[PDB]
Amino acid sequence: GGQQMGRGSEFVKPNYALKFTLAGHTKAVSSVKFSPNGEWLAASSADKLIKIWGAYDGKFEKTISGHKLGISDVAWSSDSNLLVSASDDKTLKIWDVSSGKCLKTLKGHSNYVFCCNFNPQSNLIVSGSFDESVRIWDVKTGKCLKTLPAHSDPVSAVHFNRDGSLIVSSSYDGLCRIWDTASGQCLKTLIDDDNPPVSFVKFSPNGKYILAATLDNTLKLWDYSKGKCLKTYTGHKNEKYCIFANFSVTGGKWIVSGSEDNLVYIWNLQTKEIVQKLQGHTDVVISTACHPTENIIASAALENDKTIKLWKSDC
C-alpha cells in the first residue's frame, strides 16, 4: 500500500494510533466534525446533545442542548464561531459556540432533518431531510431561501463546493445530484452501472471531485466536470447506515471512512489499496472526520459503543 510523496518519502503509509477516547454521550453518536480553526471537535448524538472537546488534548469543553429529539448531523461555520445541527424534531438550530446558546431555530422541513452544512462564506446553510427536499437557509435572518424538490427518498448528505456556487446531495433514491446554489436548478445527476442507495457524498477540498458512498459496500471518487467515476474503494462494510467518508490531505493522500464491522478504514487515494484499519470501537463506526491541519482522525460509533475516538499519525 506504500504512497509516493517527495524525495526519500517514496513509500509513505499512515500509522494512526489511538490517542483519546471521549465518553459522555448517552446514545449513539451521529456525526463528528473538527472546527475549521482546528481547536475543537464537536459530536452530535441521538441523545439530543452536541458535545465539544479540545481536538488536541481530548479535554471536555461543553454540552449544548435544546433540540427536542435526536441530532443526525452538525457542522461548523468557517470562522469556528457557529454550529448548525440537524434534528429529528424537524428543525435545524444555529448555536453560538462560545455561549452555548441557540441563536436561530430553522423551521420548514416537514420530516426529520438528516444532514447539514454551512457554505464557505457561512452566510448560508444547506439541509437535507426525510421530507425528500434540500433546503437553503439564510444564516443571519433564519429564512428558508429555497426548497429544492431534490430527491424521491430521504436526503442522506448535503455539501457546498469550495466557492459555494454548487451543492451536492445524495439520497437513498440512488442519485447524487448537483445544484446551482443561486438558481436552484439541478445541473447534474450522477449514477453508475447500478443503482444502490447513495448514503453519503461530499466535494473534494479543491471542489473538482465528489466522494460518494453507496450501500453496496462501495465508495467512489467522481470527476464532477466529466461525470465519470475515477476510483473505487472497497473492503469495508457499508450496507445499512449513512456513514461519513473523508479526504485526508494533511499528510499522505487517503480516503477515510467508518464501517459496519466497527473499524475505521483508510485507503491509498491513488492506488485504492487499504492502508490501515483502526480497531477500538465496539459498534458501527457511523462517522469520521479529518483534522484540517494535523494528521488527526476523529471517529464515532453507534448505540452499543457511544464513544468518539481521536487517532494521530505521522503522515
Q: Domain with 156 in it: what CATH number?
A: 2.130.10.10
Cβ–Cβ under 8 Å, residues 144 and 131: no
The residues near 43 (Cβ < 8 Å, ≥ 6 apart) are 22, 25, 29, 30, 31, 32, 50, 51, 53, 74, 287, 298, 300, 308
Q: Which of 89, 90, 84, 97 is nearest to 126 (CA)?
A: 84
Rounded CA gap, 155 and 159, in Å? Answer: 12
Q: Residue 275 is part of which domain span?
A: 1-315
Rounded CA gap, 110 and 91, in Å? Answer: 9
Q: What is the Cα 95 distance to its own chain's centre? A: 18
To one decimal, the resolution in angstroms is 2.0
Sign of the CA dihedral 287, 302, 30, 168? positive
Cβ–Cβ under 8 Å, residues 25 and 43: yes
**226-234: long-range pairs with CB below 8 Å, 24+:** 227/188, 227/190, 229/192, 231/269, 231/270, 231/272, 232/272, 233/257, 233/267, 233/272, 234/272
Cβ–Cβ under 8 Å, residues 313 and 15: yes
CA distances from 86 to 14, 48, 270, 291 (A): 33, 10, 33, 22
Rounded CA gap, 119 and 162, in Å? Answer: 8
Q: What is the Cα 247 distance to its own chain's centre? A: 10
Total structural domains within the chain: 1
Place of cell 499519525: 313
Rounded CA gap, 65 and 77, in Å? Answer: 18
Rounded CA gap, 132 and 86, in Å? Answer: 14
Cβ–Cβ under 8 Å, residues 283 and 240: no
The helix, strand and coil proportions of the chain, stated in percent and rounded to the nearest 5, come to 0, 50, 50
Sign of the CA dihedral 232, 31, 136, 132? positive
Rounded CA gap, 212 and 205, in Å? Answer: 14
* Residues in a beta bridge with 288: 299
Gyration radius from the chain CA atoms: 18
Helix (H, G, I), strand (E, B) or coil at 113: strand
Cβ–Cβ under 8 Å, residues 129 and 163: no
* Residues in a beta bridge with 42: 33, 52
Rounded CA gap, 92 and 112, in Å? Answer: 10
Hey, how many other C-beta atoms are within 10 angstroms of the C-beta on 115?
A: 26
Sequence positions preceding breaks in the chain, C–N over 2.5 Å: none
Rounded CA gap, 275 and 264, in Å? Answer: 11
Helix (H, G, I), strand (E, B) or coil at 200: strand
What are the E-state strand segments in 110-197?
Answer: 113-118, 124-129, 134-138, 144-148, 155-160, 166-171, 176-180, 186-190
Hey, how many other C-beta atoms are within 10 angstroms of the C-beta on 144?
A: 17
What is the CA angle 215-89-286, rounded to 5? 30
